[model samples]
Target: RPESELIRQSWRVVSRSPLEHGTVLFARLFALEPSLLPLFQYNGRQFSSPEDSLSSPEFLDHIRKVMLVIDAAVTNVEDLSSLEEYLTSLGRKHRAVGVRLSSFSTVGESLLYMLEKSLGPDFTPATRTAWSRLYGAVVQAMSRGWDG
Candidate 1:
């Protein structure tokens, strides 16, 4: 719960740097592992990478919406049943597109790498470690919750 609040605050800041945050995320992910990019990609768009879309006004708007959704989720986290149902729907939709459970870790890894890079020297070892663990834990937990 407290962690969720922290995540909410952190995302508020992270979402502000839409260009760096978005591309850094995709760059790291696509560099390390390529599959995750396609899920977020659209064939109609022409970009060197998935994160490149974030450069567009339309994509930035979508990123803002996603952060809003995350914030709302954290704010209303007490409603477990609704959260579970919504999460189940997301999982089912993802599965329909051939999303593998294992790909989440790849995305998280990219995100962590980008966070550390963006944070620069300010991203102390402890801060980096903490955020990485936080991100990884959330991803793992969501994966487990969706496994059913």
Candidate 2:
């Protein structure tokens, strides 16, 4: 749980970086695993939708604030109960948007890819495995919560 809090905080920091954070998120995600880009594309647009949303300077700022809210929620995850609820809501939203369970694999690929890119040389095998365990735990929470 402590590790999860740290990871969530790290994610919040990464998400809050002033320089094109959302675009950077997507860019790194795609660069590490371009195949996942198609998953977010609307009408065969390929990262453009998310990119377009990120293009606005205001949107990025707004997203940073939103990440702050997420940070607050995750920072208090002593039991991961709140985090589980958050992931469940996210999973439900994804299902509403027609996201399939198969897509979670792609999301996982992109997420780990982002971690490696963001951390660069700091991404050791042990670090990778640890984060993978934490990620899988949260993901399993989502999977079990979302019937879709």
Candidate 3:
């Protein structure tokens, strides 16, 4: 719980603009794992490339959804039970749409990368540890949905 406080505070300081952070995060994700590009669908049509997707309205909408989810998770980070329930629901929803469990890890890596890039010197080891712990908990909760 105390780690949640650290993660929440550090995230608040870094994510001044959720849209900006989401954009950067997704871009980095696509760059790191280009094979994941086809996973993002827009209006029933997948983009030919990451660049094409990023420039489309569909991308904006998707990124906004991601920000909202992150906001909810961040807001309830201190409440493990509540957060786990929420994440489980989210993961089930994602599974309905054909998302792989591994995708969560990719997204987490991108999110951490974005935080480190944005936070610069402020992204200390403690902050990294807190974020990692939070992500691990989230994934564990999400995995339950996949199994069930």
The top-ranked prediction according to TM-score is 3
- TM-score for predicted model 3 compared with the true structure: 0.90
Q: Candidate 3: what lDDT? A: 0.82
Runs of candidate 2 exceeding 4 Å displacement: 1-21, 28-78
Clashing pairs in 3: none
- For all candidates in order, the CA lDDT equals 0.59, 0.58, 0.82
**TM-score, cand. 1:** 0.62
lDDT of 1 by residue, 37-133 (tens): 5555454654567556656676566556544544455455444345555555665666676678777678667766766676666556665555566
Candidate 2 least-lDDT 10 residues = 41-50
lDDT of 3 by residue, 1-148 (tens): 6677777887786557888888899999989888888767767887888889878887788888887777777787776678787778888888988888988888899989988998888888988888888778778898887985
- Which of candidates 2 and 3 reaches a greater lDDT? 3
Query: How would the candidate models be sorted by lDDT, starting from the highest?
Result: 3, 1, 2
> How are the candidates ranked when ordered by TM-score, highest leading?
3, 1, 2
- Superposition error at 37 for model 1 (Å): 4.1
User: What digit string (tens of lDDT, one per residue) describes model 2 on residues 35-79?
Assistant: 554444344454454456555555456446544544554465455
